[PDB]
């Protein structure tokens, strides 16, 4: 639908329903600026079925640290309020769309 943004508790408020792709990015790494356009390229293709959400892991890293994410990029695939796939490394557009399409 859009690249939504989350924080300390708004993660859960955005992921408890539907199928949702949470992503974790910050200035620390190069992939932070490659996964980002890949996610916008994902939303404009299949955001009709999928929500995407981001945590900035310097401004809003509390959710990441709480879950035990500490690493860039990181991706938590959720549906109906639980994780169903996990990724802790960069993926191109086609591979990232496949990663969520497995459970969407």
């Amino acid at each position: 639908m859009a690249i939504v943004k989350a924080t300390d508790q708004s993660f859960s408020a955005e992921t408890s329903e539907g199928v949702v792709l949470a992503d974790f990015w910050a200035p620390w790494c190069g992939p932070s600026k490659m996964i980002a356009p890949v996610l916008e390229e994902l939303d404009q293709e299949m955001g009709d079925k999928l929500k995407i959400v981001k945590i900035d892991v310097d401004e809003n890293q509390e959710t990441a640290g709480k879950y035990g994410v500490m690493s860039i990029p990181t991706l938590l695939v959720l549906k109906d309020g639980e994780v169903v796939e996990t990724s802790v490394g960069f993926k191109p557009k086609e591979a990232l769309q496949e990663l969520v399409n497995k459970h969407l």
Partner: protein, 139 residues
């Protein structure tokens, strides 16, 4: 306090962290707990074993594992122990203090016998002095 957890975070954890936890425990006694990880860590480069043998410390028994939040977020202190970005650019959650103390990687020496030993030796002297300072300051 009997036990204070401190962490090294370094590319591959192959060498510098193995060396640094060896250096650590000769000045940071049982009062401290010292752990090490990195991007795809699980290895013990013989260069670090040699680097500790230069100062009469054995590390041949040591191990490593990938980054593990169950212990890193429980630490007081994360030493970034590289001047490198292949380490999955970790973002070290605000439960823990961070600083960078490494600046080079002896696993990336030019590869001649002389440059290999020179790279180990410079980083070995640096890491040893730095861990000795950390024991004096408590950072």
């Amino acid at each position: 306090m009997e036990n204070k957890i401190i962490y090294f975070l370094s590319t591959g954890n192959s060498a510098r962290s193995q060396m640094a936890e060896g250096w650590a425990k000769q000045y940071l006694g049982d009062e401290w707990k010292v752990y090490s990880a990195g991007i795809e860590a699980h290895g013990l480069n013989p260069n670090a074993v040699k680097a500790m043998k230069e100062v009469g410390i054995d590390i041949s028994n040591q191990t490593s594992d990938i980054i593990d939040s169950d212990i890193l977020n429980n630490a007081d202190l994360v030493v970034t122990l590289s001047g490198d970005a292949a380490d999955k650019c970790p973002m070290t959650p605000p439960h823990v203090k961070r600083e960078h103390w490494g600046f080079d990687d002896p696993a990336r020496a030019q590869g001649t016998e002389e440059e290999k030993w020179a790279f180990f030796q410079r980083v070995r002297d640096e890491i040893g002095n730095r861990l000795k300072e950390f024991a004096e300051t408590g950072k």
